[PDB]
């Protein structure tokens, strides 16, 4: 997969991702807040197309993500992130994708997600998150 | 004066200001680093002209500011920033403007200046700095 | 169980926990670093006996935890932390306990674990970690 690293920003306003019911997560893009104004992040795209797009529009600044979870598993010989769920203080977005495999969950008690990095080839291979006050 | 607030970034690449020894600092504009890329900040301009321009091009990320100092004083009855000096781990830039009035200095032992805010009318009225690890 | 919150410190020097190879994690205690001096945290004790103690002595400051992983699951009906593993930049300590249930893991790419909080009854009910640069 092709590695990517958006870096760190002031917060998150929107997440635009795609997934396929037959497989896993595909494209991933974030509209960040940068000092009170929107900053359009790079769209990180799958090597293939045919995914279903979804837009998660958060009511920034009052709404923010408190837990990210999902499942990792094998798709056509590739171990990838097959599903993602974003839970904010207001509601839950997802699960998007296929919810089977090994689970992982990052609950945040204090602090904020301010950036994403990772790798995407045919599907979302792996990802990490920048956390800050 | 007209207030301004650039916000916080990843670091600093270049500072563009102007000054007049008979008076005070005039224009102020900064090219920040935003996760690896030059971010051209808005030019905050004086309402008048007649200033001498200065460009401080830092060898980012090897070079960074370690201390900011200057003088504040009265000009035509208004209290403004009359002089500024920027010291890095490589060289010293300034002073720009006469070194008379009330001094101030901010040496940094650990950390980085990552943003500027303030107000400029005929001259730079006041300013503050964002600090981060 | 009884809740506890050690708080946040400068780093970690040693972890003293007890486990049972048929049930789950029991006692939990930590010697942190507080600006260069060892800070002996209080011992959070299980309500029952029969656990095996282990002392994890880190070579602070060159050795530090890079990933905490384990399993949570039902024991006597309710959810508890059944196993723990601590991976540092020098070696791996564990698994301790029973590796059954739902896995979890917290890998750290940048930053440090500087504090623990949670609750302990017959077994460790849950726990959270403080992170800092």
């Amino acid at each position: 997969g092709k590695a990517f690293d958006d870096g760190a920003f002031t917060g998150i306003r929107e997440i635009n991702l795609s997934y396929n019911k037959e497989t896993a997560i595909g494209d991933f893009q974030v509209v960040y807040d940068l000092n009170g104004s929107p900053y359009v992040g790079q769209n990180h795209k799958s090597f293939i197309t045919g995914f279903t797009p979804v837009k998660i529009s958060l009511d920034f600044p009052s709404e923010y993500i408190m837990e990210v979870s999902g499942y990792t598993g094998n798709v056509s010989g590739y171990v990838v992130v097959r599903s993602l769920t974003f839970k904010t203080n207001k509601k839950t977005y997802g699960p998007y994708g296929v919810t089977s495999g090994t689970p992982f969950n990052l609950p945040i008690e204090n602090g904020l997600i301010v950036g994403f990095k990772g790798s995407i080839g045919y599907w979302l291979d792996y990802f990490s998150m920048y956390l800050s006050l | 004066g007209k207030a301004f607030d650039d916000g916080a970034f990843t670091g600093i690449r270049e500072i563009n200001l102007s000054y007049n020894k008979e008076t005070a600092i005039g224009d102020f504009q900064v090219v920040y680093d935003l996760n690896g890329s030059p971010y051209v900040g808005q030019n905050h301009k004086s309402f008048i002209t007649g200033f001498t321009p200065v460009k401080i091009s830092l060898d980012f990320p090897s070079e960074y500011i370690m201390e900011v100092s200057g003088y504040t004083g009265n000009v035509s009855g208004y209290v403004v920033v009359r002089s500024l000096t920027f010291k890095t781990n490589k060289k010293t830039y300034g002073p720009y403007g006469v070194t008379s009035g009330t001094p101030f200095n901010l040496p940094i032992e650990n950390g980085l200046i990552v943003g500027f805010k303030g107000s400029i009318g005929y001259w730079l009225d006041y300013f503050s700095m964002y600090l981060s690890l | 169980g009884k809740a506890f919150d050690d708080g946040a410190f400068t780093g970690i020097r040693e972890i003293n926990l007890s486990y049972n190879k048929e049930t789950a994690i029991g006692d939990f205690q930590v010697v942190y670093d507080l600006n260069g001096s060892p800070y002996v945290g209080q011992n959070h004790k299980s309500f029952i006996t029969g656990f095996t103690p282990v002392k994890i002595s880190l070579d602070f400051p060159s050795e530090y935890i890079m990933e905490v992983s384990g399993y949570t699951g039902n024991v006597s009906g309710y959810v508890v932390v059944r196993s723990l593993t601590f991976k540092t930049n020098k070696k791996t300590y564990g698994p301790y306990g029973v590796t059954s249930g739902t896995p979890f893991n917290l890998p750290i790419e940048n930053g440090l674990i500087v504090g623990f909080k949670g609750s302990i009854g017959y077994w460790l009910d849950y726990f959270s970690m403080y992170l800092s640069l």
Partner: peptide, 16 residues
């Protein structure tokens, strides 16, 4: 010390 600001990063998940 570099001229680049840093921040806590956790992960990765999905593989490594």
């Amino acid at each position: 010390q570099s001229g680049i600001s840093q921040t806590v990063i956790v992960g990765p998940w999905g593989a490594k």
